[PDB]
Design brief:
The structure is a homodimer. Chain A is α+β, with helices and mostly antiparallel strands. Helix content of chain A is 30%, strand content 22%. Chain A contains eleven helices and 20 strands. In chain A, the strands form three sheets. Chain A has an eight-stranded mixed beta sheet. A seven-stranded antiparallel beta sheet of chain A has the order 1-11-3-2-6-5-4, covered by helices on one side. In chain A, strand 12 and strand 13 form a beta hairpin. At the A-B interface, helix 4, helix 8 and helix 11 of A face helix 6, helix 10 and helix 15 of B. The structure holds biliverdine IX alpha (BLA) (2 copies). It is classed as signaling protein. Keywords: myxobacteria, time-resolved serial crystallography, signaling protein. It forms a dimeric assembly.
Chain lengths: 482, 482
Amino acid sequence: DLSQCDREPIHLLGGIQSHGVLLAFRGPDRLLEVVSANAQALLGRPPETLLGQPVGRVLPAEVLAQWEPLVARGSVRVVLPAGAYRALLHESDGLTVLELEPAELQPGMEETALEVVRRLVSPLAGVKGTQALLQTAADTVRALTGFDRVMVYRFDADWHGEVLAESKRGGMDGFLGMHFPATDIPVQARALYTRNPLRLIADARARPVPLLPPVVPALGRPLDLSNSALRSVSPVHLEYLRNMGVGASFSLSLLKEGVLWGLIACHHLEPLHISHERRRACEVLTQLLALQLSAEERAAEASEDAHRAALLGQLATAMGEGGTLEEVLEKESERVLALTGAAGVALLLGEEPLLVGCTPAQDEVEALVAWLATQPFQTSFHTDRLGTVYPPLAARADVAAGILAVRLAPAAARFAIWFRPEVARTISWAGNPRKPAEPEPGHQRLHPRGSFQAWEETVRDTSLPWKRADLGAAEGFRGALV
Amino acid sequence: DLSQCDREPIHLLGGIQSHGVLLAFRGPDRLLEVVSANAQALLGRPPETLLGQPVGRVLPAEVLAQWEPLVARGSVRVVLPAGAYRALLHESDGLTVLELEPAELQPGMEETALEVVRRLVSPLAGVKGTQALLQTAADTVRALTGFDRVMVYRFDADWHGEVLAESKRGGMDGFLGMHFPATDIPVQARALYTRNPLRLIADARARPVPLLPPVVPALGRPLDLSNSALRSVSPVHLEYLRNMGVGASFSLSLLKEGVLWGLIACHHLEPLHISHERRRACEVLTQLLALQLSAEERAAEASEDAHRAALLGQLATAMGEGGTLEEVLEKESERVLALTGAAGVALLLGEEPLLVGCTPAQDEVEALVAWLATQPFQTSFHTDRLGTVYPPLAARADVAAGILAVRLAPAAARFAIWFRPEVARTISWAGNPRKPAEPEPGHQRLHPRGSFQAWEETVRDTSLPWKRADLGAAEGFRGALV
Ligand SMILES: */C=C/C1=C(C)C(=O)N/C1=C\C1=NC(=C\c2[nH]c(/C=C3\NC(=O)C(C=C)=C3C)c(C)c2CCC(=O)O)/C(CCC(=O)O)=C1C
Ligand SMILES: */C=C\C1=C(C)C(=O)N/C1=C\C1=NC(=C\c2[nH]c(/C=C3/NC(=O)C(C=C)=C3C)c(C)c2CCC(=O)O)/C(CCC(=O)O)=C1C
């Protein structure tokens, strides 16, 4: 995309993380085709000497007696003299990958997850607010991971992050409310975090351990590690954590009706290894919250719309009552402007501008129309920064930063227009928004930014966002007048 | 009415189930005030030799040592000789209530409950419909308890009950789709379960265990067992049970937005007990269900209404493009019919009615038109049973079985009437509904009924009920008039 950022395929780096071991088999005699460089830490034999040998003459017997449970369910606890190891099974690039990983050792771990579901799942939950919602998910994952600091990290329509809630050990500082550049996580990450919702960086200060061969022969590329648990993340992002003063990361994607609604982030000053099962315990915690977020959002809009229908029905009974239309409007203005939460309205229903409330001048709205009487909007047209779509009213951010316009007739210049003032807004970016990184001599080898302090940009000349419940309300106002 | 199957003080029976012991101390020395009569089993002394004694002597070290956690978290496991029992501590009638009942003895239950959570959360459950969702639940809450049958049991607007999802053994006489009269779960019990969300009947044939003394000295009534888990239930439900040939039942209240939506049943034919832990595990299962529902419910009504105002505005572009109305309403005749999912629409805007579609004749709409304006409604108005209230039409259930009118102004008698024909429905109850219970001669005893075979009734004259979109489509269609 924009950079080489959005180019570096992160799943094809040929590097596992030093806390596990990777074995890759193929065919119907399950010969060994790729193996991680630290095999002998668990095996007792040089990796180089086991390539091209059957499963049965490589995997230790301890693992072999579990081979049937393994191929069945994908995951089984097996004991080697090394302790207890969670072995994972999954398919990749024409092979049956096996990854070995230190098992979980807290027995009542899973009971513990039952309780933090309970806090997160309850009814009368959020009665304090859909932010406590995010506050509790934050605390809950913390109480289950034992991490220093857990944040809930959402994407805006620019794909730029902000931390909506935080939960954090003392001595840890705070990035709550701070915003985060779009390229802090490029696209190839964003879509890979769309299928794979789990990810552990167990030691940002350790050395990614390579496979051997570094390439699948028939493929002349490394094995695809898109499904790997032991995948070593991108070195810049390792260099990024290191800037952050952090030595381990874990995050969980918040899928909500699909799109990444954001993440659940986890930082720990030292390294920490989190079992596969706790890792899964934590997944359901996200899934739940996304489900919690989903039921309250719908609810929130529901009431909003009803509260709007309150007005159209009283506006309506106001009408039909008596007088012409220039009559009820006079008395009705204090709901006419409420239908969309607006500050003034224009009305070109026939006679000269009937201007109500706080509004641009007659000639200015007699101009604004002519131009709006040329653009391709069908029934409704809303925009929250009019100054860049029509600079005639650029300077008038006082009353006409945001406009919402409805077409009260076919090819007719007859409309209504709701104006809305700007609302100043302070975004607290985490590092300089101008430079997300620092590009070396030769635009060649980027390097993440190591200053993560607050910046202070003031948003101006932009109204409040025209909500879902506004568009409905004005469309409703459309079918209401002559 | 208020049958004696409403008055039965269920929380005042005075006894417990045999699988557990109840102790109730009081004051600052916690002297034994009330104690179950099977207390020797777990103590070493006659129940009636322990009344009047401080808590320390009677209760054996095992549970004393763990007093502070039991108090704080409400319960604790406690390995006695008798067995791993799980003590439970609440307050009632001014007395601390200690309940012992035997505790879960299978290691990995919690892991197991976790995995079944991941069966109801899902990337998206109900993808096959709100049906899958329900069944899936009944599947889950059976795969974890082990009961021979589980059913989901929703209460209708009159607190009658119908079964809508059911998991059961092979060769198992199931009750899906069937309806159950509302006295099968009297009022008082629903208040209580509205308080107490879970309950066990481990042995339906077994017989309650006396409490000692019978009435709490200072009350002259027996201890309030409303927050009891060993609470024996009314004997008339136990008969009911054995009538159904069942041996152990278990039920979990389905609370959502504060309206007892229904109950997940459970029924084993040999007597079986589930531990509090395991039961608790099913509380999340029932808690998560309602959450998954509420979100689907809001969703669908959102999908719906948007469609409704889609045509409403399609009904408004109709407006400005034709100086016609009595024609416009006939060119797009059914767009108005299908705001309300209707058959035919009646308008008396002024002169002669504008009957359009399937609808009675002018000479009859006029009849329910005038008497109508003599009603106590104010904007919308509607029934599915036009007869019951308007007998001049109780025979035209073919075109006007339910109506939904809407005033078009304050005074003056102009409205729109949307009509629906009847739809016939054949629901099978479980046994006769006319004789839900059976009394001895003298009318102060009432057993349950002799059988629950499919007694089938066929509903005529009633249409489908007008839903939210219906009344909200119709309300916004009024507005677009005046
Ligand atoms: C009017 C009298 C009653 C009739 C008739 C009747 O059927 N019940 C009447 C009174 C009470 N019912 C109480 C509870 C209750 N009843 C049922 C129904 C069933 N249990 C089953 O096992 C089946 C089998 C398919 C059915 C239909 C239930 C589930 C309950 C709830 C109790 C539980 O969890 O088992 C009741 C109070 C009992 C209490 O004290 O909780 C009364 C007084
Ligand atoms: C073009 C290169 C990049 C620049 C410049 C940059 O700033 N980031 C770049 C690339 C990637 N980021 C990736 C993943 C990723 N980023 C974040 C964002 C964070 N913001 C913060 O404040 C912190 C705090 C320490 C972080 C971590 C996050 C959360 C992730 C996901 C990883 C995780 O485990 O949380 C990636 C993808 C790497 C991969 O191999 O998957 C790239 C390339």
